[PDB]
């Protein structure tokens, strides 16, 4: 699958709203809890995840989650595209919440402890930190 | 340079707080717009670095900042040694900021763009963010 395709989604934990970018070709999660599901905090998350990857394209599973002008002009200066046509690791990140959620007081950063747990645990095989770092290079040169 | 050697940094601009880390060998920038310097703020900005990158060691400019118990407790649960023995890109970055002001309404939105633009540039040559993904695979396989 290729290596500029980020998914995108939110969660909802302690009424509280999770933004979830996985790297579909990899499984690495990047990760922030948002005060409110808004295309505001959407857009400057993709500004800021477009800083750090190549991102080319994104989906996501709530269509409507981008339709806002504010979404469309990060996406439109970073250079990025909606998809084309279309696990969840959402539910496993879900899992790692709750198993550290005892390890720290508040959820945001029982969050990044779960992203981290998530992108280190090797499958098998590399970890998402190695395979995603390693797709990143070995497309490039 | 080693690989998991990175340098974090508070610069102010309009008032308010940009926490920037260079990851050294590399260049690239990650960078985030806080409220206040705190070691609330520094804690958990490292932990989401370390969710996303491999980090040994952490160096800075002030070492005051590294003195609270919280910021202590987040390295030693990621698992990070602060320095041992010793540009600024932080002027670019503030120099890019300035150039993209115009463009954004919020300080933490140009301070991102910023973050997009300096780890894109190409030096010469390989940009940045291609520089840090080559050396930290090279390292791993
Ligand atoms: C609020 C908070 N306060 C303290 C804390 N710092 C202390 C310093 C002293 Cl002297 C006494 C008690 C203290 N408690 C700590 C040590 C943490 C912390 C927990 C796990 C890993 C890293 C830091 C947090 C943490 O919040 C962040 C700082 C990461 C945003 C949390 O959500 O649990
Ligand atoms: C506050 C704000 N509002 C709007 C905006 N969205 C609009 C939608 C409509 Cl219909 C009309 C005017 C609009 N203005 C936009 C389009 C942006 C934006 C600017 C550059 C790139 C991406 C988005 C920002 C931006 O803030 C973030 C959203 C990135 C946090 C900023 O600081 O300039």
């Given at each position: ?25 990899s499984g690495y999660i990047e990760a922030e809890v948002i005060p409110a599901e ?104």
């Open positions: 699958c290729s290596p500029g395709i980020w998914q995108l989604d939110c969660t909802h934990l302690e009424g509280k709203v999770i933004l979830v970018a996985v790297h579909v070709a808004t295309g505001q905090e959407t857009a400057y998350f993709l500004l800021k995840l477009a800083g750090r990857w190549p991102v080319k394209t994104v989906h996501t599973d709530n269509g409507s989650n981008f339709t806002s002008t504010t979404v469309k002009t990060a996406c439109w200066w970073a250079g990025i595209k909606q998809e084309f046509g279309i696990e969840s690791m959402n539910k496993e990140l879900k899992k790692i919440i709750g198993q550290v959620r005892d390890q720290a007081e508040h959820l945001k950063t029982a969050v990044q402890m779960a992203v981290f747990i998530h992108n280190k645990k090797r499958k098998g095989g590399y970890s998402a930190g190695e395979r995603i770092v390693d797709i990143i290079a070995t497309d490039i040169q």
